[PDB]
Amino acid sequence: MQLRSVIAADHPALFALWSRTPGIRLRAEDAYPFFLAYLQRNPGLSLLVETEGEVIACLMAGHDGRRGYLQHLVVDPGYRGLGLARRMLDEVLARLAREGIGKSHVFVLDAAEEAQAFWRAQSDWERRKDIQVFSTR
Amino acid sequence: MQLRSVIAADHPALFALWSRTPGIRLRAEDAYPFFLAYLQRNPGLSLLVETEGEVIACLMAGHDGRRGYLQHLVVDPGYRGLGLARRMLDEVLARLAREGIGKSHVFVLDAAEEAQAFWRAQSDWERRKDIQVFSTR
Structure with a gap:
């Protein structure tokens, strides 16, 4: 691993x-x-x-x-239950803070019910209720 | 100018x-x-x-x-209606395209009724209805 x-x-x-x-x-x-x-x-x-x-x-x-x-x-189906997501997520956030980046964002599809459950469960993240996102078409 | x-x-x-x-x-x-x-x-x-x-x-x-x-x-209040925002926007999007960046985003507060109105009026952009944003706390 x-x-x-x-x-x-x-x-x-x-x-x-x-x-x-x-x-x-x-x-x-x-x-x-x-x-x-x-x-x-x-x-x-x-x-x-x-x-x-x-x-x-x-x-x-x-x-x-x-x-x-x-x-x-992504965590392969055969490798769930091993803390991998959190472990990658912890290390990426620390590496970002070396570069001075203190705040991060992720976009998540409404469709993507597993992904939404994953992110709702992360205590160090919040779902944004105060913003619209506009994108180039 | x-x-x-x-x-x-x-x-x-x-x-x-x-x-x-x-x-x-x-x-x-x-x-x-x-x-x-x-x-x-x-x-x-x-x-x-x-x-x-x-x-x-x-x-x-x-x-x-x-x-x-x-x-x-930002466009100063004395310099509205001169097309400035659009002018900066078109040049930004072209400079980004040189670097390979074909899609871009902007976050806009629900409270910012004037920014909302401006982004809603831009035909080359769309308000995202398909995503949530999660941010670090």
């Missing part, structure tokens, strides 16, 4: 992970070039857990110099 | 502008060191408009390598 920084060479294994994660809709920026630039801008901030050379969990993260933003938090 | 990149030396003028802008609540990350880091990480992405040596509008922006995030959109 090893936790470590995602690097560029992890792309195949991570992309296969995301492809088999039913709540993830793959996008153009899950492809290598976007991934490479994301890692180079956020070095050390995205983490994975591997075991026996297989990647079973990840948390992609980065920031814009003001706030942190979490992206794809 | 000149539009240009925000640079580090603009901190005192921009900080005073945000201080007299009622929709903004000044936080730790608006102080000089966070501003300086934000600009270094997002060079040329934040814009301001000046006239007669006075700053009369701004749009702070940046990205985390995957998405753009807009921050402190």
